[PDB]
Structure formats: structure tokens, C-alpha cells
Amino acid sequence: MRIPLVGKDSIESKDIGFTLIHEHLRAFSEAVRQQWPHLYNEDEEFRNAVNEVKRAMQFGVKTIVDPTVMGLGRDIRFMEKVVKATGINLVAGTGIWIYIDLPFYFLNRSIDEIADLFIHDIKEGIQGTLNKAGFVKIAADEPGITKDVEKVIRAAAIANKETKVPIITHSNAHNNTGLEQQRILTEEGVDPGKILIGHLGDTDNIDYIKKIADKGSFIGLDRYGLDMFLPVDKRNETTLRLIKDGYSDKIMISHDYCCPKLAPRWSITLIFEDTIPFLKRNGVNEEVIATIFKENPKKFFS
Amino acid sequence: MRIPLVGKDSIESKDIGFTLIHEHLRAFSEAVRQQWPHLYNEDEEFRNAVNEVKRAMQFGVKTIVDPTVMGLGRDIRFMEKVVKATGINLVAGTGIWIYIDLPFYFLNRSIDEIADLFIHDIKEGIQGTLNKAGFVKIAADEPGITKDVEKVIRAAAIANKETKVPIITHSNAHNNTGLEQQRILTEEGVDPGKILIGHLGDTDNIDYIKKIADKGSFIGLDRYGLDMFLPVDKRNETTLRLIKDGYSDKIMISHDYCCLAPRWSITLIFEDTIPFLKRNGVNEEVIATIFKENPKKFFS
Ligand SMILES: [Co+2]
Ligand SMILES: [Co+2]
Ligand SMILES: [Fe+2]
Ligand SMILES: [Fe+2]
């Protein structure tokens, strides 16, 4: 209909349901695995992904959006292999995940050839299959907006324009790279409301998060559990403030989980065991959290 | 007995034969190929690799060292798939090809763990097979010696210590990164005569090339055909001068070919360099030094 699924017929924007917007089934470095298969376990990765997903479906999750692309080891075979075993709505995307420079393949070649790769996934299929991409993923971090990074950003804009699919981003919360990605995408003609700026839940500075939201774009409070970036209690503190400041129309929650001495209670359900119960406790009607997990993904893919 | 082959029983370090020390049957970037198979052809890629190798065998090539590692899309299944169609002595290796940073899988990692990856390919096997690595490959370029690049270099040393296999490198000729590779490896107890500093045939400055040869390291005149870095006539001009200055014992020639620069093929050396090289006062013994005896003592 509007949103393509992995191993399922496409569905309408409005049937997305309760949705975890940023979760990784598995995530590796293509080169490292292609060259040393002995370091991995196809069966253990598969199980860890199965019982984590179906646990999320028990809690009420209907749709998981997986932003695993090039540089994070996308594999629609493994994705459809785990959808068949769970029945989950898996939205796969396309894009490129880099911090500094991009592969030598792309050395000195056209920013429109990059976007053609995304377009290929969106319209034609992914990795030789009919599974199509529902979004495009881009990244930046400590380096931030390096010449090569910028090309990817800009290539996403093109793909958005040509296919209307939304854009999930990876950013660093402490170095303005999130705002920069928004600027460059808005400047290039991208509906601010089609942009999810991610990982900005790793900071206290609420003013920075608001400026991004005030400018039309979804804010990603999407790393619940990863206490090295921000403790759960401190993330919960913020999210509540942003709700009580009337920003629920642009808040998106997720875990950024990848199926320990400091990865404590990190999992694809930490939100239900702590986060949601904490909100309600501080008076936040099921309307204020259906917005976040149902209506915000609704208008994002609409 | 000494040097492990792809699809063949290990051979003795004295039986290398005529060898091309730096040739790539195929290279790509796993990230792009894993994500977009539609962009490649595992069949045309095979044919190009077949007829190019046997043409080198028809010029008298007995061994081909292939320094395709992580980042360049090493694939022993494709390598052994082309050895059964040619019968060529293919020496595969292990190591990491990067300029700045290495995969996110290598964050707060112990540079020994990096070494252990090489040692695994050397002693155990490559990509779940019994084909073993005969050398370790490292790189550096315009960015130079980054912190992460330096980790790879030092990890190759640890693999050298433990397995005694040689080290082939990729360097930029115009930024002292080759000398730095030798500087670090020697300072980490690496036998200077087990190191091949490559791509230094891309420059005129013979003084730079000598200082690397004078410290015990083989000099890689290994990109014949790639006129974009140096024209063939200017490489030949530069090789000859080094021979007649008594540096034949430390010279290794190759193409760095990947199955402007139009004459670039894996046999360009026989069609131009060799003929030229010996019409200008270069005996057959000294060319055997470069293509047989220098790979000999490199893998010895
Ligand atoms: Co991220
Ligand atoms: Co090279
Ligand atoms: Fe993520
Ligand atoms: Fe090479």
C-alpha cells in the first residue's frame, strides 16, 4: 500500500500500529564477517533475534523499523528468515552508515550515483529480492559533516524527493551534527516532518532537542538502555519534561538494541519494563503514549 | 613445506619460480557487494581472471602473490575456483586494508586481538577453509599514519614474530608513509628483509627509494601500467637506474592489476619493461634476481 514489509505484502501507512522505530536484529561489519566467518554464529544470532522480537510482540509491538544498512551489515535473507519465525512487521531501509570517508568504490563518483543506489532498493528491491526499502538511513558523529558524509546526506535528499520515503538519521548529541543534518536536508527540499533525527536522547540539553523539534523534525529518544550515553533514569527525566512541554507530537522512543557489565538492563523491551510505566506513574494518558508509538510513526511514513 | 598455496599442497620456499609479487585477481569492498549484488558479475569477473592468469603462465609465470585482504574483498572460494582452471600457484594473505579508521568492530580492542585474526588465517585457515595465509598485508596513504593504521602495522609485527611470514605494504610515495611503515616495523623487531614496501615506484625521487632499500627492505616497483601515478617510460627510467646502482637484490616488480593507463594488464611487464630492461645492459641473471631470487629470500 504505502510501507513495504520484509516477507509480507505492503501495508497502509495507517496500520503501522505500535511501533519500535529504531531496533537492530543484528549488526556487523561486512568486511570483517566476509573475511572471517569463524567469528560469528548464524544460529545464535538467529535465536537471540527470535525470542527478543516475539517478547516485544507479547508486549504489544506490531511493527519494528530496522535501520541496518551498508556499514552495519544489512541482510534481508536473515530478516525474512526471522520474520517468518515471528510474524512481525519488519520495515527495512537503505542508505549508508559512515563517520568519515566512504568506500573506495565511491571514490570520485557522482552523488546522483549514490542516490541511485537508494532508489534501487526503494523501487526495485534489496540485495536481489523483492523486499523494498521503506526509508533511507544516514549517519554522522564525532567527525561530523565530512565531505563524504555530506554526499550521503545529500543523496538521501534526492531519494526522498524521488520516492517520498522518510529519513532516519544517526547523530552525535553533543556536537550539533543532528541540527546540521536537518539544515542540509531542509535546505535541499526535504519536508522537516519526514526526518527523524536520532540519538539526541543521549544529552541533558533540552534546548538543543527543542530547536530541532521546533524546526519540523522528529526527535529520537532512541537509545534506552545504553547507560554509557545516558542513564535510563536521566533519559526518563527528559522525555517527561518534553512531554509536559507539549512536544509529544514529535517524540519517538526506541532502544537501538543489537541482538554487559555496563550494558545492564538493555533490551528490546526495556521500554515496557521501565519507561512507559514511569510515564504513566507521572500521569501521561494512553493518548500521550499512543501518539508516540502509533501516531508519530503513522505520520512519519504517511 | 614453507609457503601455503590456494588449492594446492604447500611448496618449498625455493620453488616459487617466476613470480608476480603484487597482482589482484579481484578487488571490491564487501560493504558494497554484500549490499548490492546486482552491481557485480561473479562470472565475467571469473573469465577476466582466467585468461589474464594463463596469459601470464604463457609468459612463464609460475606463482602469483595476491595481496587482496579485508577491505579489498578477499574470497578464497573465488581464488581456488580460478586455480583449478589455471593451475597457478596463488599465494593468499591476511591483514587489513585501511587509510584512516578500521571497522567499528575494532573499537576498544586489544591490538593483539587484531593480530590473532591474522595468526588465525596463517595457522588455522582463511574463511572457514584450510587454505592458509603466506603473508600479512598492511596499508597507508594520503592520511598517513593514523592511530588506527598504526594499530594494524603493529599487529602485523606480532603476526610476523609469531609466524615468520613476510609483510607486503601499500604506501603513498609522496608522503614518507613507506619509510614510516618500515620505521615502526623495524622498531617492533621486524627483520627488515621480511618487509616489502610497495607502490614506491610511483615517484621519481630515487633518494627516497634508496633510503628504504639501504635499511634492508625490498622496494616495490609494483604498479606498472598505472600511468596516472607514473608513466611506464618514467618507471623504466627509474628501475634501470636502481639496477645500475646495485639495488637489484632489493627490487620487486609487478603490475598491481585488478581484473589514464591503457596498456595496464598483468603481462605489460613482458611486453615492455623486460625487453627494454635488457636491451639497456641488463643480463638474464639479474632479472632472475628480481623475479625469482628476491621473492625466494622474501618468503625464506
Ligand atoms: Co545510530
Ligand atoms: Co596497494
Ligand atoms: Fe542504530
Ligand atoms: Fe594492490
Residue numbers in the entry:
A (entry chain D): 1 to 259, 272 to 314
B (entry chain A): 1 to 259, 274 to 314
Can you provide the manuscript's text about this entry?
Phosphotriesterase-like Lactonases (PLLs) are appealing candidates, being natural lactonases endowed with promiscuous phosphotriesterase activity. PTEs and PLLs belong to the amidohydrolase superfamily, and share the same (β/α)8 barrel topology. SsoPox exhibits high acyl-homoserine lactones and oxo-lactones hydrolysis abilities, and promiscuous, low phosphotriesterase activity. SsoPox is a very appealing candidate for the bioremediation of phosphotriesters because of its unique thermal stability, and its ability to resist aging, solvent and protease treatments.
Of them, the most active variants, αsA1 (C258L-I261F-W263A), αsA6 (F46L-C258A-W263M-I280T), αsB5 (V27A-I76T-Y97W-Y99F-L130P-L226V), αsC6 (L72I-Y99F-I122L-L228M-F229S-W263L), and αsD6 (V27A-Y97W-L228M-W263M) were subject to kinetic and structural characterization. The best improved variant, αsD6, exhibits a 2,210-fold increase in catalytic efficiency against methyl-parathion. Interestingly, some selected variants retained a strong preference for oxono-phosphotriesters (~10-fold), whereas others such as αsD6 lost the thiono-effect. Interestingly, the improved variants do not exhibit significant difference in KM values for thiono-phosphotriesters, but show a dramatic increase in kcat values, as compared to wild-type enzymes (e.g. kcat value of 6.89 s−1 and 1.10 × 10−3 s−1, as compared to methyl-parathion for the αsD6 variant and wild-type enzymes, respectively). The two selected variants, namely αsB5 and αsD6, which lost the thiono-effect have only two mutations in common: V27A and Y97W. Both residues are located relatively close to the bi-metallic active site, yet do not interact directly with the metals (V27-Fe: 6.7 Å, Y97-Co: 4.3 Å). While most structures were solved at high or medium resolutions (1.4–2.55 Å), mutant asD6 could only be solved at low resolution (2.95 Å). Given this resolution, we limited our interpretations and retained this data for the consistency of the study as it exhibits structural features (loop 8 disorder) that are consistent with all the other mutants. In the two other mutants, αsD6 and αsB5, loop 8 could not be modeled due to the lack of electronic density, which was likely to be due to the high level of motion of this enzyme region. Given both its catalytic proficiency and high thermal stability (Tm = 82.5 °C), αsD6 is a promising candidate for organophosphorus compound bioremediation and, in particular, the decontamination of water runoffs, soils, food products and materials.
